[PDB]
Ligand binder design. Sequence first.
Ligand SMILES: CN(C(=O)c1ccc(O)cc1O)c1ccc(C(N)=O)cc1
Ligand SMILES: [Cl-]
Length: 209
Amino acid sequence: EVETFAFQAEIAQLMSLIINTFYSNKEIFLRELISNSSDALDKIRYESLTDPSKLDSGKELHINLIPNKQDRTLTIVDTGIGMTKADLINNLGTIAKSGTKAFMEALQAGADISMIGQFGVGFYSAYLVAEKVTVITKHNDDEQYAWESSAGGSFTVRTDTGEPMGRGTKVILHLKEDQTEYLEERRIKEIVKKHSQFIGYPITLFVEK
Ligand SMILES: CN(C(=O)c1ccc(O)cc1O)c1ccc(C(N)=O)cc1
Ligand SMILES: [Cl-]
């Protein structure tokens, strides 16, 4: 039922750098994850232009932001193309080994952590704010999978028996205890307006009871 994998050494080092570096501008995680969602939504849109049946798993293309203060989670849900099991295991669809090389050279040559997305590895910015990240994904060509990692050099993959998603990717951020500002409506709104104001899909911020 649960498979445990080692990160490639370069990815483990990327994650360690994100977790251990003193860097105050953590809010950029949300821009990076919304960017990934937008890119996934563009991919299923483009495939649907020539094969409308690709949207049989859901026609609506959008992004939901779901804070839950009871669970201390921020969830980013998109209805994009989703990931196969293979692409989950292969660094969540990224060229993360080569991207990490380029990013670490850029940080040595004066870049900062906010530029992570320019190297194709923006997903890993989740670990600025999350102690654990859970990714639930569903691609038309595959079953629904759950990826998870608390860093420390490993991740797990299992077939997800949870709530069916139709198609797309859900990133569940289990926030660090000192990062609960990212569950507050006003703070999320501020970050979306500051860094994600030109994303071409609706971004709905859910509210809480
Ligand atoms: C397919 N795919 C996803 O399903 C996906 C991965 C991570 C994420 O936070 C959101 C996603 O939709 C995904 C993978 C990689 C990128 C990227 N921009 O490098 C974008 C999208
Ligand atoms: Cl690569």
